[PDB]
Amino acid sequence: QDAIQIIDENKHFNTGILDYINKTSPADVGNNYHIISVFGSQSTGKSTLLNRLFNTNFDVMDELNRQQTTKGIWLAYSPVVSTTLGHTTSKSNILVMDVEGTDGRERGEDQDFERKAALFALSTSEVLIINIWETQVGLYQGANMGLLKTVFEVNLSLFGKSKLETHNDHKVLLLIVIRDHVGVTPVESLAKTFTLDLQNMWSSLAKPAELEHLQFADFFDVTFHALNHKVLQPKEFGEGINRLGDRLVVSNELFKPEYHHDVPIDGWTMYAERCWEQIETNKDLDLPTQQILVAQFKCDEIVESVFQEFLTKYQHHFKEVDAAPDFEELGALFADLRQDAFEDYDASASRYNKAVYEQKRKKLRWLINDKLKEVFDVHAKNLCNTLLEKFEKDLVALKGKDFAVNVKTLSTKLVEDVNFQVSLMSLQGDLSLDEIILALTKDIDAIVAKQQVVELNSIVNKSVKKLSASLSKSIQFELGDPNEETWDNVLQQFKGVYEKFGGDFGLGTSSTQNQQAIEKFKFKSWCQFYDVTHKLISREKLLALLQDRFDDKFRYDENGLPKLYLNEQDLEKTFAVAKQHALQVLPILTFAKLADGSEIVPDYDIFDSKLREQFLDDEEDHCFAEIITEQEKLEVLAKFKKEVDAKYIETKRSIV
Amino acid sequence: QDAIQIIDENKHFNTGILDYINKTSPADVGNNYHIISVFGSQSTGKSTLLNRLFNTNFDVMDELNRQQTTKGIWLAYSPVVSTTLGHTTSKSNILVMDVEGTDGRERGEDQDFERKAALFALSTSEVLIINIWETQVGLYQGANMGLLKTVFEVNLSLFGKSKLETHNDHKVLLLIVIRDHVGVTPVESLAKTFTLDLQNMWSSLAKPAELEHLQFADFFDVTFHALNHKVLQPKEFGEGINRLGDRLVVSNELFKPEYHHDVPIDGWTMYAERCWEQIETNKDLDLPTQQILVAQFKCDEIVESVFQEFLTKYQHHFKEVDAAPDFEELGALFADLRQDAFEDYDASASRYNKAVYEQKRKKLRWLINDKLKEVFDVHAKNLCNTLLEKFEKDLVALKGKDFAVNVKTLSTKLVEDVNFQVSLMSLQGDLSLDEIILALTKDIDAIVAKQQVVELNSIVNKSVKKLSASLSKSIQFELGDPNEETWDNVLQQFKGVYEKFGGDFGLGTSSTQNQQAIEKFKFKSWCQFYDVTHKLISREKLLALLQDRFDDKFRYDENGLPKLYLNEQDLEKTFAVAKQHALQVLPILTFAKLADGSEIVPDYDIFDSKLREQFLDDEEDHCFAEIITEQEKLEVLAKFKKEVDAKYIETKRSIV
Ligand SMILES: Nc1nc2c(ncn2[C@@H]2O[C@H](COP(=O)(O)OP(=O)(O)O)[C@@H](O)[C@H]2O)c(=O)[nH]1
Ligand SMILES: Nc1nc2c(ncn2[C@@H]2O[C@H](COP(=O)(O)OP(=O)(O)O)[C@@H](O)[C@H]2O)c(=O)[nH]1
Ligand code: ALF
Ligand code: ALF
Ligand SMILES: [Mg+2]
Ligand SMILES: [Mg+2]
């Protein structure tokens, strides 16, 4: 005898519904039942019409004040159906859903709930009474055509899916009853119009492409019933209701099987809760008020115009890439441009929703940040490259002078000097330095690691020259007395500093390249060694070597005097001193040796052009220590006795 | 007897209005007139109510079909006013504006016109009848509360401006007549509600901050009049109208002076056209349908979710900066990510307005382009720096070998090689190469213009060494015969190749640095010249110089023989040959000269440390050509006769 709210004001679907339903009619409800519901604008007399036509007891508006009355959705079982025969029980149990009216002013702006309940109803009912005033007929929003477009649409997008499966589907009947009908305009005429309005709604909706072909008739039947002014024509109203009672129970011309999705009642109670879950929070159904939606557009409109006012005003400071830059002149010109647009946007948008206005302010800020960044970046990089040059220069300008320790301060100062010089033009850190600083650091590391190769190949080189100096010289100084211990004093130096190489180096290392800083150095000694030999001693300076010795006793006495000859005994006794004094270093220097009499071999397989350019030959190895060739060797002693003896009897003329 | 449309359906304000108005009442209309208009939902019986209450002849809907009837806005002069005394002429001329009803279905979606005409009316009238059905009272959009919020708002934002100027302003009367009033609910009750609804509308509007303080009462009076069912209560309707006739003409309780903005009628005809201009196209009034506004939101919602689906799926390919890059592997992974989001966006947004959907597709594309660009850029630059290294290397690796002509092909190939290698990863040119290519070119130009300085300071250097070789050597070779023409053969070479310097160079020039490639070169000769002199001839190798000559005749004969002495006449005749043969080149070489006997001066003011480091001294100039000093000069001839004569009588011991 009392109804219940299947779904209360705040969207709570009800738990005790099945229980309730079965406790109303003591009959077993099995698949013997109809679901009928009502939809329309606030206070169109719906709770009244259910009450009067089924015989329910939904509250109705007390007429003292026009106000919302039905809240949420309600369900009651119809005892009897008022018909022209008076009251009449029906075969089936008739379950009637009273749904809160649309477009009330209590909830003016959040049409949240109306859309939702309108779709439960539509989704869950065999027959839906669309309850309108005649005077809503040619209306658009006043006939709820907006609300409807939505509701149907989601209905298709959310359960026009189930089908091609041949129920007993939900075709639902759209039972459209016209209230306060005067008669002046024929219902058949009202009907034409409003079905047209519904056909149009149908073409107007978003359709998932699988269903794009689907029509309104496929999903829905429509019929009509007019009802006279209840207050001013009480009787004609009453008869009109009864006439409608006969329509559904007596003639049984309304309900058909197709509406009834054909399962026991518990199946429905379930299908409902389900249907309500999928409705209560649906993405296509979530909507912000008109106001927000309006503010959004309003605010973009401005974003663009203020921005367009930002653009061709910046196409004018920066078409020209500045000649004479200043990062405090710039970060200011920047702040100022951003200041203009804001205050102009603000002048026209602070009216609207603060949040939308705010959301849309931030959007503009970063539209103009990203146009300011472009310029910031340009200069900022123009700066790096300049500085960097100086820095590269700076490195070179201190050859090897304590590398690692100068790398440090210098590289620091760069990074620091950029950070500051460029932070002045970034607008409260709005425009980022991170990517710039990273790209700088990488650049520094690229440079040092190339200045390092230049200092590490310089130390190799400028070490091979304090070697070549002390080396090719303490050859000669040694050579003014060819001893048992020349080589004993020669490689004792050749390798006395062929190690200290050169001490550590102080550059940043490369350890396994610090180490291979030497295997060029050590290869190049074993390359210049041979080259000094093949240059100090050759066919040319060898023939020459004879006389440097030759004269010291064949033309000189006992104390540095040019020998005073005595007999041709003294003339032909000091002639043979030289024949040896011009043969007696060759065993110290034919093929070059060591105080051990064993051959000298090179550290590396040179004479081969493959190990060669890693640091920039006949049959065997045109041998390393082969200073004087195949013969060239004895081509000196074909001349030993030609020139030297063109002096022995050729200077005999001076005893006469 | 016929009205006219001040503004037709499509917004054309009418030209012949003043003329029309004056031709209606033969009375002179001067400031003796009222402006009264009607506002409300389609077919609320407005044209009917004007007709019945003033006695006009606006068409009315023929009841065969519910449809729009009044189109645009109309104006007619009221002959008489129906009142309870029957018909009554009034003192003032009453000008009545019939405005097309809101919310018709003929124009369902474009509320353009209704907003506009609703605001003309409100802006232009002393009294505005808001004509509603009782059954619209507790409604929101069905009571037009949306349309209104707008209309008032713009009204404030567009002419609540004029004021603080103390007219006779437009307070306008809001004359709200309730149609088909049954009586069940007291008009006073309806009134309370609906004025409340209007107060709320008032708090709900955008207000320019100057006016934020302004209230609804400041701008507007409201009163009410109920009217019974015209068809079902013809008489009570009639009496109700008459009762309203008495209200404005008999009691004269409606019109007040404050509504009347107090100027002659032509002033009004003007104020109207003006008001209509500022309305017909106003920015706050320009609006897109609900549908678009809805699609916009709908489509952003998706943009974000599809994008968020793009982001943390890319935070996953690129958190890790790739180790092993491939630009065809990449431009593909890119296209594919962009492919996913699209087809997912498309799967959910192709429903809505194509244009909004399209607009909003493009928006997503470039959201993801700009996230793809970041990665494209990274690698793309990783590529430039690698290549560049090779290129820098490549330049150096061809010392001077035809610079300009190798600069060309090499620099081309780089640019080309980048363009191609990086175009493969840009997505149909969506992501730009322009800024990359520019930054490359600048980089190339930075490098060559530094390799050039290295090749141009090398040619200076390695030219000063084929000079120093032929130079310090054809000194000595010349010096084996100190002639009248030594210097004649010495600077003839010193400046024989101190010009060809060195021929053109073939590098890219710097012309006025190609030219200053030499004013180092020419300065450094005038620097090494002096250095060779101060090194070949000094205290050391000078004392030495004596004997190189000394021996050739004091110890040698006529053909290369060591002189065979004869008498102590032959012993002390060839002793004085040397005293000169050891003094007779000094006038060829004390201070160094020219075959003219004039001093040699340097090209540059050297000995001064200021012109110095532009290419890396006592009282006068510790003179340029001062090879042997203050004395050092005669410190050789304190020893001339010590060592050389420790040989004349010291080798006299060999005649015994
Ligand atoms: N003019 C008119 N008034 C009605 C009619 N039916 C009911 N009313 C009254 O309209 C008011 C609204 O009724 P209610 O049934 O509570 O409307 P709901 O909110 O749409 O359910 C009540 O005062 C009813 O007495 C009708 O058919 N015509
Ligand atoms: N129920 C009712 N019908 C009316 C009333 N006044 C006029 N009508 C009818 O309503 C229809 C609309 O009239 P019209 O005056 O052309 O309306 P408008 O478009 O708002 O100007 C006409 O058929 C009128 O006969 C009324 O007060 N109540
Ligand atoms: F007031 Al209602 F449905 F319109 F309860
Ligand atoms: F049909 Al109308 F104003 F509502 F002409
Ligand atoms: Mg109700
Ligand atoms: Mg009309």
Side-chain angles (χ1 to χ4, degrees):
Chain A
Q1 236 215 340
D2 270 14
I4 33 44
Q5 38 191 4
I6 22 175
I7 131 266
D8 65 20
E9 300 87 310
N10 328 283
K11 318 254 228 314
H12 178 251
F13 204 108
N14 191 310
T15 274
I17 177 66
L18 212 193
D19 252 59
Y20 169 89
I21 288 181
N22 284 132
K23 301 174 208 284
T24 57
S25 62
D28 302 303
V29 193
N31 191 47
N32 189 44
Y33 74 84
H34 287 111
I35 304 308
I36 184 74
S37 45
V38 82
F39 163 85
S41 314
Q42 190 159 291
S43 312
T44 48
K46 286 184 306 281
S47 302
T48 288
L49 149 108
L50 297 186
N51 283 355
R52 284 288 295 262
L53 151 74
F54 306 101
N55 262 263
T56 55
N57 197 244
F58 297 136
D59 282 4
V60 281
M61 181 196 305
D62 78 296
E63 304 177 318
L64 229 201
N65 283 291
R66 291 191 77 85
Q67 57 187 132
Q68 179 189 54
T69 306
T70 330
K71 281 202 298 182
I73 297 179
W74 291 69
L75 196 138
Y77 164 71
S78 148
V80 275
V81 165
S82 48
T83 58
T84 63
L85 323 147
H87 294 347
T88 290
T89 259
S90 53
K91 310 156 140 106
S92 23
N93 300 78
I94 293 196
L95 299 176
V96 27
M97 273 189 316
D98 197 14
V99 36
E100 126 167 357
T102 84
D103 198 345
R105 89 202 255 295
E106 289 82 1
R107 67 226 307 167
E109 196 185 43
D110 80 11
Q111 315 159 251
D112 181 51
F113 183 99
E114 77 186 51
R115 308 191 190 100
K116 268 175 196 180
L119 169 92
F120 181 68
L122 169 64
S123 64
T124 284
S125 289
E126 287 147 74
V127 175
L128 189 71
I129 116 80
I130 284 159
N131 173 270
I132 44 182
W133 302 117
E134 171 160 45
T135 54
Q136 302 179 251
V137 158
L139 263 30
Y140 189 72
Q141 313 268 108
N144 276 286
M145 275 312 97
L147 182 47
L148 258 9
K149 208 226 84 199
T150 288
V151 164
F152 278 61
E153 205 181 65
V154 155
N155 189 52
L156 187 52
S157 96
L158 180 56
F159 347 74
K161 247 69 209 141
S162 98
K163 197 317 147 150
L164 213 191
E165 355 137 77
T166 45
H167 353 224
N168 221 26
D169 69 288
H170 258 341
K171 265 229 203 201
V172 339
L173 184 56
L174 291 184
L175 171 59
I176 153 79
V177 14
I178 305 183
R179 304 311 278 282
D180 303 350
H181 176 65
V182 1
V184 137
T185 304
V187 184
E188 299 81 32
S189 201
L190 303 183
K192 192 21 196 287
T193 291
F194 196 87
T195 71
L196 226 12
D197 281 344
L198 289 155
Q199 303 195 329
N200 296 358
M201 174 201 44
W202 192 249
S203 300
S204 115
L205 10 76
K207 295 198 263 300
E210 51 268 51
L211 316 162
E212 211 82 49
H213 60 118
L214 261 5
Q215 291 195 48
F216 180 80
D218 298 352
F219 278 87
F220 291 106
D221 285 319
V222 286
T223 207
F224 287 96
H225 198 65
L227 251 38
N228 296 137
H229 199 292
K230 150 194 152 65
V231 187
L232 298 162
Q233 307 203 268
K235 166 190 112 140
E236 295 76 358
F237 178 68
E239 318 179 327
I241 293 288
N242 297 345
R243 212 129 84 256
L244 186 77
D246 292 4
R247 268 253 258 155
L248 46 49
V249 125
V250 167
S251 152
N252 283 107
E253 75 159 58
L254 251 29
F255 302 125
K256 321 292 212 44
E258 311 83 280
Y259 310 154
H260 195 258
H261 216 192
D262 222 354
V263 314
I265 206 47
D266 50 341
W268 184 85
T269 86
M270 281 176 210
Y271 183 73
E273 197 159 20
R274 265 210 303 296
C275 288
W276 196 220
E277 279 174 13
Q278 303 160 80
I279 325 280
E280 194 185 5
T281 169
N282 190 245
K283 344 176 307 208
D284 262 299
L285 263 209
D286 206 332
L287 289 206
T289 111
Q290 177 77 182
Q291 136 168 146
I292 299 310
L293 290 228
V294 184
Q296 296 197 218
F297 172 103
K298 286 261 200 177
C299 291
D300 304 320
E301 110 208 311
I302 299 169
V303 159
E304 265 297 337
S305 77
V306 169
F307 190 64
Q308 289 311 331
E309 273 186 19
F310 164 85
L311 255 50
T312 322
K313 194 184 162 205
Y314 144 113
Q315 197 261 156
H316 177 268
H317 299 13
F318 297 117
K319 264 274 88 181
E320 276 235 277
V321 196
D322 153 287
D326 186 347
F327 303 95
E328 68 167 351
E329 278 155 52
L330 273 263
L333 165 69
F334 282 18
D336 187 277
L337 277 216
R338 198 139 119 307
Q339 197 34 74
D340 304 312
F342 277 174
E343 76 151 40
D344 285 8
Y345 164 96
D346 298 322
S348 290
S350 56
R351 318 184 194 185
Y352 311 53
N353 174 260
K354 256 191 53 220
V356 175
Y357 152 78
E358 273 180 352
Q359 185 214 348
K360 294 270 184 318
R361 207 184 190 251
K362 176 170 315 192
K363 181 219 195 193
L364 169 78
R365 155 168 311 207
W366 289 94
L367 272 130
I368 287 165
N369 276 6
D370 303 16
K371 297 307 286 186
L372 291 192
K373 185 178 223 48
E374 282 197 45
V375 177
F376 165 96
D377 278 1
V378 152
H379 287 47
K381 201 203 197 292
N382 277 5
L383 168 72
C384 286
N385 297 327
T386 280
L387 246 43
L388 283 173
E389 266 163 30
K390 176 57 60 93
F391 169 81
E392 197 156 4
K393 233 250 64 57
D394 267 25
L395 282 170
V396 85
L398 261 60
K399 38 276 291 252
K401 176 250 182 287
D402 294 293
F403 206 58
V405 205
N406 272 337
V407 166
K408 192 161 201 169
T409 118
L410 281 174
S411 301
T412 289
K413 207 47 53 167
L414 185 44
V415 143
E416 296 189 342
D417 254 284
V418 150
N419 202 48
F420 175 84
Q421 196 60 298
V422 156
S423 279
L424 293 141
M425 106 165 138
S426 100
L427 303 156
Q428 290 182 313
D430 262 324
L431 314 153
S432 171
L433 271 59
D434 289 16
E435 33 56 289
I436 257 28
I437 261 30
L438 181 139
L440 179 64
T441 319
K442 69 171 177 61
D443 272 358
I444 290 158
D445 295 9
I447 282 166
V448 295
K450 103 191 273 202
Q451 188 63 125
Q452 295 179 318
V453 285
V454 151
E455 298 312 72
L456 201 74
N457 237 208
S458 194
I459 263 155
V460 178
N461 274 65
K462 281 95 189 298
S463 181
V464 172
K465 289 206 165 192
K466 291 335 122 215
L467 203 274
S468 258
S470 37
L471 193 272
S472 245
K473 144 211 260 180
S474 284
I475 282 212
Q476 273 176 142
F477 152 85
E478 302 295 313
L479 256 167
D481 218 298
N483 305 311
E484 191 197 9
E485 292 217 6
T486 49
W487 308 113
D488 285 308
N489 289 77
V490 157
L491 279 83
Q492 210 194 121
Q493 172 261 341
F494 174 83
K495 310 212 164 178
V497 158
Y498 167 109
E499 296 258 345
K500 270 206 348 222
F501 177 149
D504 73 13
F505 334 59
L507 285 200
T509 94
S510 265
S511 186
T512 85
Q513 270 282 8
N514 243 22
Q515 289 166 315
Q516 278 178 317
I518 324 163
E519 306 221 320
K520 274 195 172 195
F521 169 98
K522 295 215 166 181
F523 174 93
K524 292 185 193 207
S525 282
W526 291 95
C527 262
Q528 271 280 288
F529 195 56
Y530 176 105
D531 255 28
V532 154
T533 73
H534 283 241
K535 142 206 132 73
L536 296 198
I537 303 158
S538 52
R539 286 210 289 185
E540 192 254 82
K541 196 59 176 192
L542 210 46
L543 280 164
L545 222 176
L546 267 130
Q547 339 316 144
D548 307 307
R549 304 148 61 80
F550 163 89
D551 225 77
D552 312 333
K553 282 181 186 179
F554 190 78
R555 225 163 225 270
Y556 281 83
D557 198 47
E558 263 272 297
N559 305 119
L561 324 154
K563 246 173 181 75
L564 193 147
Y565 276 134
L566 302 244
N567 187 294
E568 294 225 323
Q569 289 170 282
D570 259 40
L571 181 86
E572 307 171 85
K573 252 192 178 165
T574 52
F575 151 71
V577 167
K579 313 185 70 144
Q580 189 203 20
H581 232 96
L583 283 189
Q584 77 136 245
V585 77
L586 300 158
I588 299 172
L589 336 152
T590 27
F591 216 78
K593 253 84 215 173
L594 38 107
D596 323 75
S598 25
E599 189 186 337
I600 309 179
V601 230
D603 261 13
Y604 302 94
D605 303 48
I606 313 147
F607 256 107
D608 170 41
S609 58
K610 280 148 185 174
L611 251 143
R612 247 179 84 183
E613 281 158 339
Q614 316 177 6
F615 328 84
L616 193 129
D617 42 306
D618 254 313
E619 279 73 30
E620 197 224 88
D621 184 39
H622 194 248
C623 220
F624 163 77
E626 187 191 302
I627 298 109
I628 206 75
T629 86
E630 304 286 49
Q631 311 79 335
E632 311 164 336
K633 194 265 271 271
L634 300 157
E635 183 55 70
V636 189
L637 264 135
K639 344 219 95 179
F640 172 110
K641 238 172 190 71
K642 280 188 172 168
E643 167 260 322
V644 154
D645 257 351
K647 274 160 150 184
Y648 156 61
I649 300 169
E650 192 264 7
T651 57
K652 191 169 173 180
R653 309 205 149 210
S654 47
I655 298 180
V656 191
Chain B
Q1 236 215 340
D2 270 14
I4 33 44
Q5 38 191 4
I6 22 175
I7 131 266
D8 65 20
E9 300 87 310
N10 328 283
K11 318 254 228 314
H12 178 251
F13 204 108
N14 191 310
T15 274
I17 177 66
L18 212 193
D19 252 59
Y20 169 89
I21 288 181
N22 284 132
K23 301 174 208 284
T24 57
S25 62
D28 302 303
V29 193
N31 191 47
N32 189 44
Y33 74 84
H34 287 111
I35 304 308
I36 184 74
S37 45
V38 82
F39 163 85
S41 314
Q42 190 159 291
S43 312
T44 48
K46 286 184 306 281
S47 302
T48 288
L49 149 108
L50 297 186
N51 283 355
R52 284 288 295 262
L53 151 74
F54 306 101
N55 262 263
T56 55
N57 197 244
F58 297 136
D59 282 4
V60 281
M61 181 196 305
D62 78 296
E63 304 177 318
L64 229 201
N65 283 291
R66 291 191 77 85
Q67 57 187 132
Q68 179 189 54
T69 306
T70 330
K71 281 202 298 182
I73 297 179
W74 291 69
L75 196 138
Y77 164 71
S78 148
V80 275
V81 165
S82 48
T83 58
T84 63
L85 323 147
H87 294 347
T88 290
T89 259
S90 53
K91 310 156 140 106
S92 23
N93 300 78
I94 293 196
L95 299 176
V96 27
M97 273 189 316
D98 197 14
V99 36
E100 126 167 357
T102 84
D103 198 345
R105 89 202 255 295
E106 289 82 1
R107 67 226 307 167
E109 196 185 43
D110 80 11
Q111 315 159 251
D112 181 51
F113 183 99
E114 77 186 51
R115 308 191 190 100
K116 268 175 196 180
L119 169 92
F120 181 68
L122 169 64
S123 64
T124 284
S125 289
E126 287 147 74
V127 175
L128 189 71
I129 116 80
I130 284 159
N131 173 270
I132 44 182
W133 302 117
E134 171 160 45
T135 54
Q136 302 179 251
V137 158
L139 263 30
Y140 189 72
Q141 313 268 108
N144 276 286
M145 275 312 97
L147 182 47
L148 258 9
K149 208 226 84 199
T150 288
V151 164
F152 278 61
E153 205 181 65
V154 155
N155 189 52
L156 187 52
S157 96
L158 180 56
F159 347 74
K161 247 69 209 141
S162 98
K163 197 317 147 150
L164 213 191
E165 355 137 77
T166 45
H167 353 224
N168 221 26
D169 69 288
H170 258 341
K171 265 229 203 201
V172 339
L173 184 56
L174 291 184
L175 171 59
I176 153 79
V177 14
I178 305 183
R179 304 311 278 282
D180 303 350
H181 176 65
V182 1
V184 137
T185 304
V187 184
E188 299 81 32
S189 201
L190 303 183
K192 192 21 196 287
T193 291
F194 196 87
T195 71
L196 226 12
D197 281 344
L198 289 155
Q199 303 195 329
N200 296 358
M201 174 201 44
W202 192 249
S203 300
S204 115
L205 10 76
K207 295 198 263 300
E210 51 268 51
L211 316 162
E212 211 82 49
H213 60 118
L214 261 5
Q215 291 195 48
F216 180 80
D218 298 352
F219 278 87
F220 291 106
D221 285 319
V222 286
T223 207
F224 287 96
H225 198 65
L227 251 38
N228 296 137
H229 199 292
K230 150 194 152 65
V231 187
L232 298 162
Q233 307 203 268
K235 166 190 112 140
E236 295 76 358
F237 178 68
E239 318 179 327
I241 293 288
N242 297 345
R243 212 129 84 256
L244 186 77
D246 292 4
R247 268 253 258 155
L248 46 49
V249 125
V250 167
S251 152
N252 283 107
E253 75 159 58
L254 251 29
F255 302 125
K256 321 292 212 44
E258 311 83 280
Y259 310 154
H260 195 258
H261 216 192
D262 222 354
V263 314
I265 206 47
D266 50 341
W268 184 85
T269 86
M270 281 176 210
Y271 183 73
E273 197 159 20
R274 265 210 303 296
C275 288
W276 196 220
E277 279 174 13
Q278 303 160 80
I279 325 280
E280 194 185 5
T281 169
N282 190 245
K283 344 176 307 208
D284 262 299
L285 263 209
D286 206 332
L287 289 206
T289 111
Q290 177 77 182
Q291 136 168 146
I292 299 310
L293 290 228
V294 184
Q296 296 197 218
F297 172 103
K298 286 261 200 177
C299 291
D300 304 320
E301 110 208 311
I302 299 169
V303 159
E304 265 297 337
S305 77
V306 169
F307 190 64
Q308 289 311 331
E309 273 186 19
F310 164 85
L311 255 50
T312 322
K313 194 184 162 205
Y314 144 113
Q315 197 261 156
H316 177 268
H317 299 13
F318 297 117
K319 264 274 88 181
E320 276 235 277
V321 196
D322 153 287
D326 186 347
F327 303 95
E328 68 167 351
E329 278 155 52
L330 273 263
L333 165 69
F334 282 18
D336 187 277
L337 277 216
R338 198 139 119 307
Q339 197 34 74
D340 304 312
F342 277 174
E343 76 151 40
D344 285 8
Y345 164 96
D346 298 322
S348 290
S350 56
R351 318 184 194 185
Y352 311 53
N353 174 260
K354 256 191 53 220
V356 175
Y357 152 78
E358 273 180 352
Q359 185 214 348
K360 294 270 184 318
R361 207 184 190 251
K362 176 170 315 192
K363 181 219 195 193
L364 169 78
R365 155 168 311 207
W366 289 94
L367 272 130
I368 287 165
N369 276 6
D370 303 16
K371 297 307 286 186
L372 291 192
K373 185 178 223 48
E374 282 197 45
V375 177
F376 165 96
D377 278 1
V378 152
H379 287 47
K381 201 203 197 292
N382 277 5
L383 168 72
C384 286
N385 297 327
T386 280
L387 246 43
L388 283 173
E389 266 163 30
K390 176 57 60 93
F391 169 81
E392 197 156 4
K393 233 250 64 57
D394 267 25
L395 282 170
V396 85
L398 261 60
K399 38 276 291 252
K401 176 250 182 287
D402 294 293
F403 206 58
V405 205
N406 272 337
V407 166
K408 192 161 201 169
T409 118
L410 281 174
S411 301
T412 289
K413 207 47 53 167
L414 185 44
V415 143
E416 296 189 342
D417 254 284
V418 150
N419 202 48
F420 175 84
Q421 196 60 298
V422 156
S423 279
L424 293 141
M425 106 165 138
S426 100
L427 303 156
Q428 290 182 313
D430 262 324
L431 314 153
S432 171
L433 271 59
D434 289 16
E435 34 56 289
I436 257 28
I437 261 30
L438 181 139
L440 179 64
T441 319
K442 69 171 177 61
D443 272 358
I444 290 158
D445 295 9
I447 282 166
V448 295
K450 103 191 273 202
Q451 188 63 125
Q452 295 179 318
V453 285
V454 151
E455 298 312 72
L456 201 74
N457 237 208
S458 194
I459 263 155
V460 178
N461 274 65
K462 281 95 189 298
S463 181
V464 172
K465 289 206 165 192
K466 291 335 122 215
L467 203 274
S468 258
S470 37
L471 193 272
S472 245
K473 144 211 260 180
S474 284
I475 282 212
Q476 273 176 142
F477 152 85
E478 302 295 313
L479 256 167
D481 218 298
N483 305 311
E484 191 197 9
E485 292 217 6
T486 49
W487 308 113
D488 285 308
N489 289 77
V490 157
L491 279 83
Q492 210 194 121
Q493 172 261 341
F494 174 83
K495 310 212 164 178
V497 158
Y498 167 109
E499 296 258 345
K500 270 206 348 222
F501 177 149
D504 73 13
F505 334 59
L507 285 200
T509 94
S510 265
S511 186
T512 85
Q513 270 282 8
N514 243 22
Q515 289 166 315
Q516 278 178 317
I518 324 163
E519 306 221 320
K520 274 195 172 195
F521 169 98
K522 295 215 166 181
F523 174 93
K524 292 185 193 207
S525 282
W526 291 95
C527 262
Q528 271 280 288
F529 195 56
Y530 176 105
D531 255 28
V532 154
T533 73
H534 283 241
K535 142 206 132 73
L536 296 198
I537 303 158
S538 52
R539 286 210 289 185
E540 192 254 82
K541 196 59 176 192
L542 210 46
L543 280 164
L545 222 176
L546 267 130
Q547 339 316 144
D548 307 307
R549 304 148 61 80
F550 163 89
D551 225 77
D552 312 333
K553 282 181 186 179
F554 190 78
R555 225 163 225 270
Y556 281 83
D557 198 47
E558 263 272 297
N559 305 119
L561 324 154
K563 246 173 181 75
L564 193 147
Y565 276 134
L566 302 244
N567 187 294
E568 294 225 323
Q569 289 170 282
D570 259 40
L571 181 86
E572 307 171 85
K573 252 192 178 165
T574 52
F575 151 71
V577 167
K579 313 185 70 144
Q580 189 203 20
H581 232 96
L583 283 189
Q584 77 136 245
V585 77
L586 300 158
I588 299 172
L589 336 152
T590 27
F591 216 78
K593 253 84 215 173
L594 38 107
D596 323 75
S598 25
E599 189 186 337
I600 309 179
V601 230
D603 261 13
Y604 302 94
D605 303 48
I606 313 147
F607 256 107
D608 170 41
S609 58
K610 280 148 185 174
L611 251 143
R612 247 179 84 183
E613 281 158 339
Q614 316 177 6
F615 328 84
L616 193 129
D617 42 306
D618 254 313
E619 279 73 30
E620 197 224 88
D621 184 39
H622 194 248
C623 220
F624 163 77
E626 187 191 302
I627 298 109
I628 206 75
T629 86
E630 304 286 49
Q631 311 79 335
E632 311 164 336
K633 194 265 271 271
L634 300 157
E635 183 55 70
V636 189
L637 264 135
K639 344 219 95 179
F640 172 110
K641 238 172 190 71
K642 280 188 172 168
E643 167 260 322
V644 154
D645 257 351
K647 274 160 150 184
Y648 156 61
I649 300 169
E650 192 264 7
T651 57
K652 191 169 173 180
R653 309 205 149 210
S654 47
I655 298 180
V656 191

